Structure formats: C-alpha cells, structure tokens
Amino acid sequence: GSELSERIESFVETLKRGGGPRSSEEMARETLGLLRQIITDHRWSNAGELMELIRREGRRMTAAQPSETTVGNMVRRVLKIIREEYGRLHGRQESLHKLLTSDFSFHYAQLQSNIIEAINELLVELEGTMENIAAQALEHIHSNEVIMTIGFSRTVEAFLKEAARKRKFHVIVAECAPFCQGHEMAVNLSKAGIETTVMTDAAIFAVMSRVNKVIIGTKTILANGALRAVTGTHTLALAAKHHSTPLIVCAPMFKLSPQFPNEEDSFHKFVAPEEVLPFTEGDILEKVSVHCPVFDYVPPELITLFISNIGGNAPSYIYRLMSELYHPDDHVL
Template structure:
C-alpha cells in the first residue's frame, strides 16, 4: 500500500513533504475514488512502528485532523479523502471508548439525539492506553478489507434488480456500474443503452467494455436521452459523491438523465460504495464546482468567436434526492431518506467538519 496520504497517522513527527505527495496522489486518483480512499486509510500500516504507545488519543486525532485538512485542500472536489479521514477518526474514538470502559450503547443512540447533543459534549481523550495502538491498527486493517470488497459486494446484488429482457440505461463510465452489469449478465440477458456523456465521451469506453462481455450495448448522444427514456425499464448510474441530504454530485449530464427518468416514472438506481457518502451539504458550493478546458466543446482554433464569448465546461452535475429511487451500496439498498442514518453509523458528528 502506498505510503502517502495519512502517512503521519501513527507518527508524531510532521513530514514537510506530505502536502505535495498527498496533492499529487489526490490529483492522480481523481477518477479512482476507491484507490484514493484505500491509500489514505492504508498508510497507517506503513508507519505503525513510529507511533509511541504513550501517544494520547486526543493528540493523535488532532494530528490526523490537521493532515486531513491539508489533503482535502489539495483537491476539494475529491471528497473521498475527507471521508476516509473521518472514518479513521471514528475508529480511534470507538477503540478508545472500549478501552475507557464506555459501553457501545452510546454509539447506537438515535441519530437525531446524537446530532442535538454532540455539540455540547466534549469527550476526554487524555488517558493513555498502551493497547490502543494495536487495536487501532487492527480496526484499520478491517476497514481496508471492507474497502477492497466494496465493488464485489455491490455487484453481488445485481440479480435482485436486473431481470431478463430489460432495457437498462446508464451514462458515462463507472467501474462500479460496469461490475454490476457484468455480474447480472452472467445469468440474465438484457440490453444496455449508454449515453456518451459529452464532451468527455466516457460512455464509449463503457460500451466497449460491456460489449466484450457479450452484452447488447448501444451508444447514443446525450440529446437523445429524453426520446429514448420511454423504452427504458431502469436507469443505473454511478456517482462521484453522495451528499448528506441524499443528493448526488455526478458526472455532467446526469441531472438531465434523472429528470427524464422522473418524467417517465423510470426507477433511477445509484450504485455507490459507502466511502462516497459525505457529510457535506450542497450549500458548500466551492467544494463541488469544477471546470475544465472547453477545448472539446469549442476548439481554440475558433479564435474569432472565443474573443467574444466566455465558455464554461463543468465536470459535475447536482442531482437532487427527489429524483433518486434507490441507493445500492456495499451494505445493501437504501432510500435517499435513509442517508442521515448511515451518516451517523459511519462518522462521528464532531468530525463532520475537519
């Protein structure tokens, strides 16, 4: 496992080179949330020998939170990094609580009660526990195993949602959706329509990969989504981020697809592992807006036109929760209204803001 990301998790000596390494890792893995998340969580195992047993849990959590802020600042739109930092903080809190003699009952309270009371409570992490180091490392290793199997766990549920002779529509390329459809194709015969997701046209890559598995696949332009939707039985998509209100930050064009599905009462299913669930809300716009060069839309050779207009090429769409029918994650299927409950199970309320 690469030793970048939270390479200081089990160390008390800050490394000056962490920010460039983490920034490079985040940028290189911007389309591979799973790889980036595993790197962030896996780094502690590479430095397990540098954490002194006498290190206080509070100091360790402050260090992780500080480095988490630095990594998220390198690429704010890569929410997976912050999510994994929060998961590690939750692991430390839980292991400290067990050693401190606190019952796990406090972690199983109603979510609303936790949200209302957490702001006024301050936990004491000042007691050193020598076994804490080994317990935290073991828990992080379990988290790594969970991350490794997320795609397979989602794909295993495919036969429950895809039936024979159905027409499935998707957009762009998603490794999770690809695995989901391939698993269903082992026992079911169905047709897939892929919207090309212009101007990046990642849908072409998806179509090629599916056709190699003998899945009947058709590529269409994004403009034809509404016209074709009446023939579609289900829409299955991936996403970049699941927000705290159950909304999505997904590839550009997904909102159009979701609106068409809603108009035709076509179920929209989102395949996404739990590490993409973020406690952020859509009002934090600076974290989600991302624009790239409009070269694919309007080439720079059109100099005469470019001098007179401004061209914006957004990478992501915001998809509100009312357009989503079901989330399929590595822990099962859930409605958008249940997201708040999953948040309380994955992250501690005090860690929502790093």
C-alpha cells in the same frame, strides 16, 4: 519521517494536478494506507494529539482537491474509528433520548494496535466491496430489460457483467461529453457479450420513454441523499422522474459524505475550456465566456434506491447511514 513526509507531499501534488489513481477504490486504499502510515510513524502521546494531526492532514488533503470527497470520507472514517476505540478502551449521537437522559488526554498502550487492526479490517471490507455490490445484480435485473447508463462506472460495469452471466438484457450507454468515457464502457460491455447502444447526452430524454430502469454511479453521496455525479446526470434524473422510471445508484459506502448542499461553486469541478471550445476558434474566444463543469448536483427526490455493499436502501434512510459512519463533530474537519 522523511518517507512519510515525501509520501504525503506526493499524494497532495497528485491530487492537486489530477491523474494518479483512476479507481475510486484505489484512492480509498491509498488514503487508508497513508493514514495508517501516519498513525504508525508520527509520535503522539494521547488520542487528542492523534485527532489534531489527522485533522490537519485531512484538511490539507481536502484543500488540495475538495471535489475528491473519498479522501475526506476516509479521513473522517479513521477519526470515527479512533474515537470508538478510545471510547471502548477508556469509557463505557444527538437525540431526544440523549437530550433527556445525558476527555482524550488519557493514554493507553494497546490503543494503537487496536486502531491499526480496525483500519486493516476496514481495508479488508473495502477490498471485497465491488463483488458484494455485484452479487445483488440478479435481484434487480429481469429478463429482456432495458438499462440506461451514463459515462463509465466500474461498479455499474461489474453489476452488469455479473447480471449478464444468467440473463439477457439491453444496455444503453450515454457518453459523458466532453470526456466521452461512455464509449469505453460500451465497448467493454459489448466485449462481455451484452448488447449495447452508444448515444450522446442530447438523446437522454428522447429514449427515456423506452428505458425500464436507470443504473448509475456517483462521485459523492451527500447527507440528505443528494448526488454529486458526473455532469448530465441531473438531466438524466429529471427525465427518469418524468417517466417515473426507477433510478438506481450503485455506490459503495465509502462515497458517503456528511456534507450538505449548502456549499456553493466548489461543488462542480471546472476545467479548461479547451474541452468544450477548442483554442483554434480564434478571435471570438476573446469575448465568449466558456465554462466546463465536471460534476452535477442531483436532489434526493430524484433517486429511488441506493445499492451498496451492505444492501439496498432508500434515500430517506441515508441520514442513518451517515450517523453510523461519522461523528457529528468531524463534519467540519
């Protein structure tokens, strides 16, 4: 009750004010733990009340920070898990087959235990996601290869550190200005023994002619295979497409969102202009419009491969993955 309410309020305020969990996996774990706490603590008779309350909590969580899709992704995953559990315990996708062939009020005592067990299994699968993704590094990196990365991605870092145990290759890291987080990635990879280069975004095209493949992370994967990545990733994808350089996205399955690129102006995250133009400029700040978008939209035609904890896939298959994770009625939430 009070503990649950204060935990929810703290989570919402942390999302609204930023900071909190740097790791996306940590954010997913905290979201799942909070959802489990709501399921255990909150009182509900039938599954319909659970749907309504989880939907309200997820709506509040995503309204706190719409650019943080992992929270909504986990909320929809929990809703799908609850729906599947109810269908298994009570009963026995839209398609041409279903179209040709063709009630949550009922109550069950053991449904809650099954829901918690499924959520715990999901958490266990989430725990080993990074190792599962990194275990595929040797199948995609050959000897004396050149890899291009932008910003700081922990999944890509684990990928490269696992590949470096048996192969020698070069990694080029482009800083993601203004938050030049690529410097930390470069120094980490150098500490791991990999030979690394640090450069600004302005050189992304210039050196792309000498890059064998591009390995990047993302914040979100849309239903059509599009990316909500850090800013400057669209230019990197365009430069890779110019040279037909394969672009690999190493992203866990919990970053898949059933949304579509129809949404406008809430996609990119806009922050204080101080990052781009300092406050000490003076009077010219009065008449100059300064905008600092954090995220970028990447169309699916610029992506070659998705590597996740379940293996490799093409963007054209992303829809099927989206069909296996979320019910079509939970996209609106």
